[PDB]
């Protein structure tokens, strides 16, 4: 009774890979599918060893290991489009390493992932990352502010946003995060109340609101 | 004039429910004491009055707090309506 025969009718939905530790690794696309598989193993339908894996879980586990043995490495994300040959994106600016060192890193990752035959390390440009973020916000016409730091960029979006703006921001941010991860660029969405509706005010230099005739207010 | 309509109808509804309870108690007691005289075939004028008085006094001892709540509520409400325009 092979494992593929037990997962269901839709044979396309799952992918079975044999590992060097002689264990079957089942690759899933999402949580719902993950639990659909884990139930079969936990019930004990299959008799040999097997495990269930997905991109998010492996990203987390690998990051935890890097935290211990490479506490200063600057990197983005590991892609499993072809699970047998993952792609690891490193920064070009924030890392200075030799080719030998990179090769060693490659081999240690390969030892952590017994289902992968090799790890391809690719160098990406930070300026590109930041630029595609800011261009995506201008494309959506959101109001925003940009703040720059030595090791990261922060985009602040705040105000009395409309429902169509909240929806657009949410879709965009969620699309970007999947490609780049969350390590270099951060987005902050902050809804605030409206002081101006129904009041007169001066704006530009020397701006002030006035709550009511005879009552001036001077924001900072 | 929905305000005059409301205040006028509520006044009468309040009269009806404030007064109903004592008279209900008095009537039920009246009937039972009238019956007992028939099954006993024994007759006097005073026994029903005597019991009715006690029945109504107990009714008032019990409910009177609620009479105050209801009247204060209505008293405020009508004043606010009268002076509502300003």
């Amino acid at each position: 009774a092979e494992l593929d025969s037990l997962l269901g009718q839709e044979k396309e939905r799952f992918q079975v890979l044999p590992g060097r530790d002689k264990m079957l690794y089942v690759a899933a696309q999402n949580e719902r599918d993950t639990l659909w598989a884990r139930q079969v193993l936990a019930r004990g339908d299959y008799d040999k060893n097997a495990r269930v894996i997905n991109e998010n879980e492996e990203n987390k586990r690998i990051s935890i290991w890097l935290d211990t043995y490479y506490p200063q490495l600057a990197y983005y994300r590991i892609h499993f489009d072809e699970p047998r040959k993952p792609v690891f994106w490193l920064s070009r600016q924030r890392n200075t390493m030799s080719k030998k060192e990179l090769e060693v890193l490659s081999q240690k990752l390969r030892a952590l992932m017994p289902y992968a035959d090799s790890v391809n390390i690719t160098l990406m440009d930070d300026v590109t990352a930041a630029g595609q973020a800011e261009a995506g916000l201008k494309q959506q016409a959101l109001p925003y502010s940009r703040r720059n730091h030595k090791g990261g960029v922060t985009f602040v979006i705040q105000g009395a946003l409309d429902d169509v703006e909240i929806l657009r921001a949410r879709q965009f941010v969620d699309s970007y995060y999947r490609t780049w991860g969350g390590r270099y660029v951060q987005f902050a969405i902050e809804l605030k109340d409206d002081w101006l509706k129904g009041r007169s005010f001066q704006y530009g230099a020397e701006g002030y609101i006035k709550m009511s005739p005879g009552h001036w207010y001077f924001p900072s | 004039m929905d305000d005059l309509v409301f205040a006028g109808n509520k006044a009468l509804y309040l009269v009806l429910i404030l007064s109903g309870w004592p008279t209900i108690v008095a009537t039920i007691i009246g009937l039972l004491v009238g019956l007992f005289q028939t099954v006993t075939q024994l007759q006097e004028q005073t026994l029903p009055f005597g019991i009715k008085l006690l029945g109504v006094c107990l009714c008032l001892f019990l409910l009177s707090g609620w009479y105050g709540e209801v009247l204060l509520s209505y008293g405020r409400q009508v004043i606010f309506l009268a002076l509502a325009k300003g």
Binding site: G8, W36, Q39, A42, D45, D163, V164, L167 | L81, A84
Partner: protein, 183 residues
Amino acid sequence: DKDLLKGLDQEQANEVIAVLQMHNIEANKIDSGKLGYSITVAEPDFTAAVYWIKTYQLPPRPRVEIAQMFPADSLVSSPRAEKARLYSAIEQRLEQSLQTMEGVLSARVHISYDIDAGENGRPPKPVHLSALAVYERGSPLAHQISDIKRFLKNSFADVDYDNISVVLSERSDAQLQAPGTPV
């Protein structure tokens, strides 16, 4: 087989079955008539079925509507009670109208009850509205918020686009294949 639940309604049973099937748990529905429906599963799946029943807080409860609090028997019910029943009916009729729009699967609607004051003595406040809705897959949500706002704005005497909140979501993936039977 182990008994999970007894005396369920038809509506509770079909929700429980739907939720267990989604997680690959084969369940059985039995009818006892005046005693209602019963749900059963195999032992290998018992633990999981228990954990899910707790996590989703099944069986579901009855569905609340404000008019249930104010059934009128009086000669005179308060200006509060009448207004409450009125708004509690307009809400339901709007949800039923929205469900007819193109490709909406379900929706829910909420109105600000000013009636938490009788508005005796004090001037009435303007209305606010909120709605939730679920769409078929492949719907341009951004382009479809406009229609709903336009439709709701003119159902009430004073409403501003600023005071209308609309939240939309897509249907999840379809569950078509049956769960596997324990070996």
